Design a protein around this ligand. Sequence first.
Ligand SMILES: Clc1cccc(CN2CCOCC2)c1
Length: 460
Amino acid sequence: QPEPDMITIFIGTWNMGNAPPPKKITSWFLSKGQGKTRDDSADYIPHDIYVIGTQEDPLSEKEWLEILKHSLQEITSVTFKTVAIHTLWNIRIVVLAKPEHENRISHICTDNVKTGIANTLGNKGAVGVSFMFNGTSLGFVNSHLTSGSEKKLRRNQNYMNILRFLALGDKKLSPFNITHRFTHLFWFGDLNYRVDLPTWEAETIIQKIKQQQYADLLSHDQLLTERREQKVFLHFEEEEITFAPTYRFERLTRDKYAYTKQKATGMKYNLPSWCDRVLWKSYPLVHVVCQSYGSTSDIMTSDHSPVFATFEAGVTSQFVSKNGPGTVDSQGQIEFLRCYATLKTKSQTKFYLEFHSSCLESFVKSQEGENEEGSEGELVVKFGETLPKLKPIISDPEYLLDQHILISIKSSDSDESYGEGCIALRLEATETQLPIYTPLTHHGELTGHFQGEIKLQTSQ
Ligand SMILES: Clc1cccc(CN2CCOCC2)c1
């Protein structure tokens, strides 16, 4: 039985509005409704992994697991295995996988982050799950961010707290937050960003939605505008939105948006908005293709509609050779030529690099770089030809060209990372000097760049 080099992943996000679900929710898992929808000819084909995020979920874990598993069994005639379930307050994540994947899945990690302080601590935050699928690391974050049209900055702050403090993946990757720990990271939830138009325009917005004319609404979506201004979700991707706003509906129909201020809303308007979203970030040059992104039309218990997204995702096998794992393979090496970091910092410590990769027995520390002044004010840290030669565990190009090197640039004075990035080994050539590049971030914000040349030796 061959190991896969692709899987499909279902992501769902649903703010249930504290109400039990209706008796049938299969349209959600079938990617049927509005937006980019899944072909009918695929209905019986199970996804490999289903990741379900709920917010305002009133059910026990047991109650929801029974609904989810029976829903998938009805669709696919497969009894899915439960990989993980984690709940913070009424924010929940469930991971289900086809039984054939049970021995391919390992290193399962769950965590949560509570956002806010005092007033603002007690119902918002995030849950997450990570695991290995053969040679590929997968992370999944379900967040419920701060509500209200005039709180986009609080949402951005919530995002940064979650990516700093959610403890998923390989704890040996100490300099790296969740935005660098996974081959594929999916971040979804009730992110609660709104369409920023005047309240007086509510009926105009509703008109536009009835005409399926979303362009003038999406141009005011706060998540798209904040992302374009690099205020949040830097280096994440989102499929184009082609479904109606998923909030705020009158319950038991989808015919009416309920936007007017009420005591129950704290006297706040809820203009129709794309609160419910799926984003992802994958390592450079790894296959990831969104195959659906939409909302259901027939699940009406909540004031939100469920959102679905599906993905093809490249995966690799758990590689064994006659040498590594358990030793190096002298036929493999990774060299860096003419490398330099450009940093936005005003500080003047010496810096060194750390190279982290599951193709190395352990991480590698460089010598300190040489600091120079850039012509536009910047710190340039030069490594020249001084970077250590990296010794991979396996030299076979079928393995090595699918790997990635994480880079942290650290202060010699404090050993704190000033920037993190990632370099793909999926090169155009081996034994050839080739340009490399990554942006550097710290706490998910841009802090600089790393560029230079690489030379990769494989056994071929
Ligand atoms: Cl699908 C799945 C569900 C629950 C746990 C696991 C991890 N496994 C790996 C091998 O079997 C034992 C534990 C996988």
